[PDB]
Design a protein around this ligand. Structure first.
Ligand SMILES: [Mg+2]
Ligand SMILES: [Mg+2]
Ligand SMILES: [Mg+2]
Ligand SMILES: [Mg+2]
Ligand SMILES: [Mg+2]
Ligand SMILES: [Zn+2]
Lengths: 29, 98, 175, 70, 48, 273, 103
């Protein structure tokens, strides 16, 4: 369970900037 | 006047080994009313339970008291939220709540 | 030219409870102290990719001398049969690179593969032994090597050689 | 409001509870903020932060190492 | 609790509390006049 | 008909489920899009989420007139029997039936067999009506209402007899998607009227309370119209809609239900936007 | 071509599959005043740290000790025959193959 969480934390870090978050949300839209 | 500092001492008389200044701050506002309020909780206990509906006693002592507080939000210690509905007849303060 | 067109065409096409329980679990190599390669030694064996040779020619860099400038140590470049075949298929236009590859100081090592694809051959040697350094400028090959622990990558940055995952880099360029 | 040129700007206070040390009409020191970027939970378009009040760093006041002179 | 308090004490205390739900509307002539105005307009416009 | 009715129910629920899924997709796309266009801020829960218009049961509203049956709870009071008598006159073609020792499921099967379109059940408290249940019988929706301020024609002396003609319908205040759903159920209880009808029945929504008014108008002259109020007067408050018939409390799903213990339930309305 | 007769889709359409999947999931779920030490060193609200952090040399010593423990999971340590051989002291697994394939 801890190993699974740590993998998601890296993805959360992989977009933790404000401009990065708005980047995908236009792209998913 | 506002914006002036102040200093708090417990006793100007006598000598004590410790630091004597108790507190420090600034003046903010002047008025004729304080408007400060305190929290008061009125407590009751269930004595008859019908699924969601329960009969509560001990919160009030008369049917006039329940009428003033109809529709008020109530809750348990466990966190279940409820509402006062009506006053009962056989205990003087008992009421019905969902 | 149609050599260019055929190349881009090729790259486009490139993309019961009684039974004994048996399973293949390869052992972790004893050479590695976590992510650090201790058996990698001052005589360095470097596997050279075909496009590494060509870009060394464009940057006016001698192969052995520039590697020694990066590491301050004796370096032995290694050429596989897969890499040598790809230089030969390029033709007379790349005859200079072919002559450089056949240098008596270089280490000529055989390989018995099916196919000529040299990115697959170099990855396989990296998995097996963990004693080589990989010198390439190819981006997707570098991505595959980075997933394999304990193998440094040598590449060209500006007009000098650079190294990627080696603690004993010493005379390596700064940024 | 900056003293040098009179412009009005919006700045961040580093932490809630440092607002208690700051009063209105106080003199503060302002530095830049946000060249690297804006974190999650930060309001975009604010490019300034408050560093000192009455020439005392906010962290020193928060940690109880210094007292604000009046 | 009710035991500690005097009888009928809270009628003069003026405490503050929250009501759970919106109260039912009260009907008056003014609401009747407003509502009939809506009907009269839609009759005039023949909007059904 | 046990086997046939089960087949028609399953396909009806299947089509209803697909319609809900595609609409929920639209709301997620719409709410996500408006947030970034504002550029104010990104809620963290929004980040987690990102990373046949006509109702199926109402095929036959226009082709044929509805058939309405009105009944009460067991052992009705005297005044409840008067209220059910008045509701019969309000709905054209409606019928009122005595509830004896009739099981609820037995009533529904008889109504389905004889082609009754809709079934109405009314409850009372100390002689005043307090609840109303509207059910669309061919596996249609069931709506549960509570009555607030009931004024009967029997209370008011010397009113006379009503026009009993097919009335015009007025729907006002229903703007949200749920309000459009609710107004449909009330409207389809009535037949298609005539153009020259002078009878008007009004449903007006105000803070999730629906007012029922019944009127007849006369045009003495141009631009001036006189309204005389006739018929019962009461308020309606919806609290539940269920997909199945009122014989199916234990199996039908809930399309919408009122939640009064929500932290923000007091200040929220659902029939208007 | 039709599916296998044993398959449920052989006799079920999409309507039945939608209802059966929901039913299956639901059933499966079930006199001098000296200042104090506090005044003399205005430590204030300083984060509390362990005693090991005080000396960087002994802190590095513990990191090396733990690292050798963590390495024991990856790799086997070399040991001599300081006693007469008497078995493995653990199991002998016969199905696990650790050799490296050469190709
Ligand atoms: Mg290649
Ligand atoms: Mg009887
Ligand atoms: Mg009764
Ligand atoms: Mg019987
Ligand atoms: Mg030291
Ligand atoms: Zn090969």
């Amino acid at each position: 369970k801890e190993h699974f969480r740590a993998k998601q934390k890296e993805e959360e870090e992989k977009l933790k900037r404000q401009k990065d978050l708005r980047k995908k949300l236009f792209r998913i839209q | 006047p506002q914006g002036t500092g102040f200093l708090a001492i417990q006793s100007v008389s006598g000598i004590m080994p410790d630091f004597r200044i108790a507190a420090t701050g600034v003046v903010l506002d002047l008025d004729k009313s304080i408007k400060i309020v305190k929290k008061l909780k009125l407590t009751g206990f269930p004595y008859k339970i019908f699924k969601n509906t329960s009969f509560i006693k001990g919160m009030f002592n008369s049917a006039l008291e329940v009428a003033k507080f109809e529709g008020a939000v109530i809750r348990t210690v466990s966190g279940i939220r409820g509402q006062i509905k009506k006053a009962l007849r056989a205990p003087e303060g008992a009421f019905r709540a969902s | 030219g149609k050599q260019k067109k055929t190349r881009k065409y090729a790259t486009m096409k490139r993309m019961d409870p009684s039974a004994l329980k048996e399973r293949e679990v390869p052992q972790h190599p004893s050479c590695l102290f976590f992510q650090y390669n201790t058996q990698l030694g001052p005589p360095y064996h470097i596997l050279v990719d075909t496009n590494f040779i060509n870009f060394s020619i464009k940057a006016k860099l001698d192969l052995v001398q520039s590697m020694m400038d990066c590491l301050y140590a004796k370096c032995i470049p290694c050429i596989t049969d897969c890499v040598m075949a790809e230089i030969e298929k390029l033709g007379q236009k790349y005859r200079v690179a072919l002559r450089i590859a056949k240098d008596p100081r270089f280490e000529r090592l055989p390989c018995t593969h099916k196919g000529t694809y040299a990115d697959d051959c170099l990855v396989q040697r990296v998995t097996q032994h963990k004693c080589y350094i990989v010198a390439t400028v190819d981006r997707d090959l570098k991505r595959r090597i980075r997933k394999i622990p304990g193998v440094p990558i040598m590449y060209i940055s500006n007009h000098r050689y650079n190294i990627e995952r080696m603690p004993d880099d010493y005379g390596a360029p700064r940024f | 409001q900056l003293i040098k040129n009179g412009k009005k700007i919006t700045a961040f206070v580093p932490n809630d509870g440092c607002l208690n040390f700051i009063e209105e009409n106080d003199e503060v020191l302002v530095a830049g903020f946000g060249r690297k970027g804006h974190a999650v939970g930060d309001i975009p378009g604010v490019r300034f932060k408050v560093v000192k009040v009455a020439n005392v760093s906010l962290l020193a006041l928060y940690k109880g190492k210094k007292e604000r002179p009046r | 609790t009710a035991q500690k308090r005097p009888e009928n004490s809270l009628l003069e205390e003026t405490l503050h509390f929250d009501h759970a739900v919106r109260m039912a509307p009260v009907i008056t002539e003014e609401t009747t006049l407003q509502l009939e105005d809506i009907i009269k307009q839609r009759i005039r416009d023949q909007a059904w | 008909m046990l086997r046939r009715e089960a087949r028609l129910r399953r396909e009806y629920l299947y089509r209803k489920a697909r319609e809900e899924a595609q609409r929920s997709a639209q709301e997620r796309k719409e709410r996500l899009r408006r947030a970034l266009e504002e550029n104010r801020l990104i809620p963290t829960e929004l980040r987690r989420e990102a990373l046949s218009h006509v109702d199926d049961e109402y095929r036959w509203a226009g082709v044929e007139d509805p058939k309405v049956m009105i009944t009460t709870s067991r052992d009705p009071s005297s005044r409840l029997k008067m209220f059910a008598k008045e509701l019969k006159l309000v709905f054209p073609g409606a019928q009122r039936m005595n509830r004896g020792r009739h099981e609820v499921g037995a009533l529904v099967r008889a109504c389905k067999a004889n082609g009754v379109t809709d079934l109405l059940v009314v409850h009372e408290h100390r002689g005043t009506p307090v609840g109303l249940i509207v059910s669309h019988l061919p596996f249609g929706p069931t709506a549960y209402f509570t009555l607030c301020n009931v004024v009967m024609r029997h209370d008011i002396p010397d009113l006379g007899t009503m026009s009993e003609a097919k009335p015009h319908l007025i729907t006002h205040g229903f703007s949200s998607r749920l309000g459009k759903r609710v107004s449909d159920i009330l409207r389809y209880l009535f037949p298609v009227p005539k153009d020259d009808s002078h009878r008007v029945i009004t449903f007006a929504n105000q803070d999730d309370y629906i007012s029922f008014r019944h009127h007849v108008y006369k045009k003495t002259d141009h631009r001036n119209v006189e309204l005389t109020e006739v018929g019962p007067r009461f308020e309606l408050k919806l609290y539940m809609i269920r997909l199945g018939t009122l014989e199916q409390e234990a199996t039908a799903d809930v399309e919408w239900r009122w939640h009064p213990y929500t932290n923000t339930a007091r200040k929220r309305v659902f029939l208007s936007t | 071509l039709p599916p296998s007769p044993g398959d449920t889709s052989y006799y079920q359409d999409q309507v039945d599959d939608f209802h059966e999947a929901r039913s299956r999931a639901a059933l499966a779920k079930g006199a001098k005043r000296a200042i104090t030490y506090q005044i003399a060193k205005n430590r204030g609200l300083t984060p509390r740290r362990k005693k090991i952090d005080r000396n960087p040399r002994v802190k590095h010593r513990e990191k090396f000790r733990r690292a050798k423990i963590r390495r024991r999971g990856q790799v086997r340590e070399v040991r001599k025959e300081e006693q007469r051989y008497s078995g493995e002291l653990s199991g002998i697994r016969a199905g696990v193959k650790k050799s490296i394939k050469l190709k």
